[PDB]
Amino acid sequence: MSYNYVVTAQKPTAVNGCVTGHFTSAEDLNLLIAKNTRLEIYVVTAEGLRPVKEVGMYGKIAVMELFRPKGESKDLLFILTAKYNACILEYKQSGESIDIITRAHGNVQDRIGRPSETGIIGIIDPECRMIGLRLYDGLFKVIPLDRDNKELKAFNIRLEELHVIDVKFLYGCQAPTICFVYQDPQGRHVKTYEVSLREKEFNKGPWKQENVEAEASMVIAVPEPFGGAIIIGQESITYHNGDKYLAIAPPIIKQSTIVCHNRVDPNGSRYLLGDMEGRLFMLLLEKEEQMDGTVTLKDLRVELLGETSIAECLTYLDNGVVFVGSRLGDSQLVKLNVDSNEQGSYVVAMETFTNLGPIVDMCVVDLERQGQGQLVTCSGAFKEGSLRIIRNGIGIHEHASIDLPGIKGLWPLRSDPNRETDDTLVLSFVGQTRVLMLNGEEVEETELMGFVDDQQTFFCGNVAHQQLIQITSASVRLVSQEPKALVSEWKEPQAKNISVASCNSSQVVVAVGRALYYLQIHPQELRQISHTEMEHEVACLDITPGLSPLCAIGLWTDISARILKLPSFELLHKEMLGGEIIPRSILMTTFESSHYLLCALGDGALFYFGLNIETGLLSDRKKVTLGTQPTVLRTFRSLSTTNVFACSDRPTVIYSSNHKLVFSNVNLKEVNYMCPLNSDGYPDSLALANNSTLTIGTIDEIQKLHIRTVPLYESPRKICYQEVSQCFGVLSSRIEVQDTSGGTTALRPSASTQALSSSVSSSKLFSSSTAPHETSFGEEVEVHNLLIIDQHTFEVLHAHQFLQNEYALSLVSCKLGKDPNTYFIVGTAMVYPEEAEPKQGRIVVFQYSDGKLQTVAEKEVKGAVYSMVEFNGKLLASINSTVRLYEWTTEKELRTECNHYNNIMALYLKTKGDFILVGDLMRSVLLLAYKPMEGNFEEIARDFNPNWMSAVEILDDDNFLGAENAFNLFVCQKDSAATTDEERQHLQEVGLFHLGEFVNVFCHGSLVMQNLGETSTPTQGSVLFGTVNGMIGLVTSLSESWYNLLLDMQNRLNKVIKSVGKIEHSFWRSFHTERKTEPATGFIDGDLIESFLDISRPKMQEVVANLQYDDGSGMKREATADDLIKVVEELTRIH
């Protein structure tokens, strides 16, 4: 009855395991990267990674290891799902069609058994004769590997050791033996077993059990030349081979605990290690003891290769390249320069893969431009937490790429008779001007006779009367079309260097000092048309034709624009575009179906104006903060009619339908200059030069989420937007180490120790307190901060540091009571390690004005403040279990008004209108209504169920959305039409779904246009959510008929589209929980419905062999096989 529709907008980006091997071919070195439900296959090249395929599996990738059984050339791929789905994939490409076929599949889940707290472990026999799996305590599941085992039939083997940490398969053994470390009451031990498939049980191990340190956690199987296992904990690294026993206690690995490893040598002579912090060690195996052929060890020295990202799964590619995956940071490709020793850090970064990471809290902001609301997340954690800004920016498809040394301008040029195309591109260096004739993909450059070799030419285009005049600093050189030789050269009257030169269809304008000279274009000749001297320096000028009806003049020292006749100097109109800085460029075209003009300056704002045809100058004063660097204006023919391109530090395209111009983003980090070019290979294309290189191509759909990162070097927790002050308020936490001299020292310079203005909260509203257990040396204290970040520059304007033991939890920007000021409000809580439940909390009200964060009110409460909201000018807070509402008095002091006592912890608060939704981690959804007449709270409904909720959200007055345990989603509903009190006082759980992610935060708003569309949209509303992995979903409501149609379409598609591993979709989306499992209802999968636009036409014809297409009233049972495509496209347009 919920009738919802959940669709992802961004794919998960957190790498949870990567591995290399020959998968696509017997010669390549493939790299496969699992991201959660997405499998990515790359081919490792000399210069980096070349993407090959992006395949989506119906499940959570929990185990991924490659094996090559005898009789095959390319490795297979055993992938296990967190829902216990096992498959053996194999790459299969036929020329151009690529499919991931499944050799064998099955389900390895047992009927009864508690999953191990150490999680699923999947290991493979080195000889590829068995697969070991640890799914439940004291049960080792063995999967025999045979050609006829298409069903993957496994059998259990009993482990007498209940607590087993890590299991691995040893190398170079006759029978398949396993080595593992297990916890027993005596301590920690390492034990070896021998697996017998015929006996279907264990036997005596190769070498007897030993004793390891109390922390020894992970085991590494050394290959055949050495033989044995290596066990590493935090204090010691040991090597066991039966009669051989080596051990070290290096002081380098003491600081952190090694969690991930990799082997870089085929014979296992060197290994890579990665700890929590992100320092990359390197274990070396010394093979100098070849006494009598046996390659035994001599020492176990450990090296340090320098700090890297927070490593979760290392992967050593060839040619000394390491892929350092990261679950909460950015995935990296580093290089082991083992010889360099820059500062002791051998590793140097080569690439970086973006990662939205653990989105902790997000906000949806509306920085002008109408709709297109930006989305700001507090991504990352520890030393790489950052803010990510996400938009909907059109992507640029570059058909070719050519490197340029930062060209100061590119113009088209024809090296042939005029064929309405340009086969030569003329660049402009700092002082030189290199021109290359590129009909196709040519790169050779040869200067022509008509163009000077080095003259710093600015404008070089096709002049009229079969000629071409290039204006240079020294003089303008004119070259005819067919002769291609110099015919005239009309230098400056003062022989000065023209700072700005304008080339038109038949007029050439040169600005020398404060004077200007316009010359009409004559056939193979130069003739002056007018000469004048402006009042001030000419900032910029342009002519927009044959004869330009009007011309523009800019003031460099005054920032004043004037309009004068092109062949004369008669002033027409004047205007001032703010006067902050001198304009950089100006232009005028028919982008908005009218002769609109624009002027761009070096403040990153553009001033628009409305110009008539013959003589008309309007104001149209509007400045938009497009960018943060100086711009450049250009017009590209590959558009609707002309449009306009503004290259900046965020490139923007001026798109207008009939009367509204929008600066749509362009998916590029930075664009320096761009110019249209009709190349023979790519006619009507655009050549854009960036700050480092240049590209040539076109544009595409808006289907792109451009992501800009702003590092903070500390963990960000909460964020809100303040429109009045135009700044973000974000909490952050830096982990600084206690010092023995008295005080604490920061580990690294974060965004709170590098701010403009900093303050320390000295408002000690309370005294005394206790701490008998003194803060010992080496302890790490988490110090909190409130940062006031800008919105278009992203610099920390203010950084307010709270008290000692001040864990700030909530943060809300709102204006309370009748006050006109917008106040920052933070609800903190004192936590001491001695006390369990905090007793003292604070509500502090900051007011960021004039660049200073002054405190207005500091309220003390008996408890902790978990979440805070606003009621039309009242502040509702949740002190521990109570729910308090605060009235803002005229004397700037919070005054309590009413209290509601909940037996649960009021942890999640989500309100709309007068209804209040309260919940806690145990998933106890409670409803409240504030009655203004009585001025007190009332309890409307309840829903109590033991489970781990993660986030809750309001969808409507009746429907309440929320995630819960095992990555599931539920929707509760209240039936106000219920006859009895009990029926309407209990929430009915109507919707269930299995998203596959741990949802952290819910929010309203959408990233797409807010266009009403007259007759509204098929989907009512939009709710975004961000998860731990990094995806961004979108839950929107639907009608009953649309829900039925989409449900039947999904059921029909489930029997047509094949899935890797042959996993049934209904089982994948089933509501999964340790205690019970029920099929999904009330939710429509978005990805599956969107996947209707890529399959082949016969598949569509099979899927659409029924239904009603437009409506049941019109029948249309055939449905024409295309109305459903239109419906799917209209659904896809929501994101």
Added chain:
Amino acid sequence: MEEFHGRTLHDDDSCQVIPVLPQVMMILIPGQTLPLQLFHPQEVSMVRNLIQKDRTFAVLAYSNVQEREAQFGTTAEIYAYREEQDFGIEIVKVKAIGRQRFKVLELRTQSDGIQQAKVQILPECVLPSTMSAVQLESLNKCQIFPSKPVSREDQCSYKWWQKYQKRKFHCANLTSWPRWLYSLYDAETLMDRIKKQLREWDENLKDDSLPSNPIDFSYRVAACLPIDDVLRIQLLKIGSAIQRLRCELDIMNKCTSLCCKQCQETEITTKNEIFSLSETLTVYKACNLNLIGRPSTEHSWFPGYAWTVAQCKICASHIGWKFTATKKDMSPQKFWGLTRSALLPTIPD
């Protein structure tokens, strides 16, 4: 009694109709033995029939005895059953242990005299670890901690537990909530809190007198600690281990008034006035106490502290001594070193 070796386990969420003896009208939490003695011939026949059939019985936890209406109850399996023929009256002695809790869907009375009701076995569900959803795959190997070193010398054991909520809840930084909030929902951390607090009420050996299973531990503490009937019904409502433990702490921190044992009606002191400046519980102030004897300071472990015998007003039992300063410039002047086991805290209403 008759030795019983079989184990009865009714299926969860399965409806069943069973008879309930009317003599018992109290709430019997699971895991608590409820011995009785039936004398009526109808009760003896019903007990014999139950023992031969399934050795099970029902006990509906009535909110009000007079109304005889119960929304929930507990099923009891007869661990020991005996028959006695004395004084010409047959006596059936049953020592049963509660096994499951059921909600009485329908109530009915049989013609024989007993009342047979149909109830559904409520599911006492168990929740997994709160970090199982968000645990990093690479960090799984570091979650099996290093045993549980317990010693009275460590006392608070502050260092070890500070390392628990740093290796068990490392992954809390991936979620919007802090580790100290998750530590309020940790089953073992909760059992930690009840255990140390209960050592402030008694001299029991908590090492073996208390279980390690959260579900079994939660049941007996709810039975052991003294509360009213309505509170006992309230805890019986919860079907989860963690929520039941959470309710227990609230029914265990909202009992401040240190009333006497034996008395169970007079108020000795309050937990607010605890003279922790310098076993025994020291209270800076006290009321409703009678001091007798002489200020004998011999062997007084507390120096400048002379003590005298004490009594409540009527209980007349020794509950401690009001230490008195032996010097003019000595603070506090009078502190009562009452015995921990001599007081039973109750809700300060």
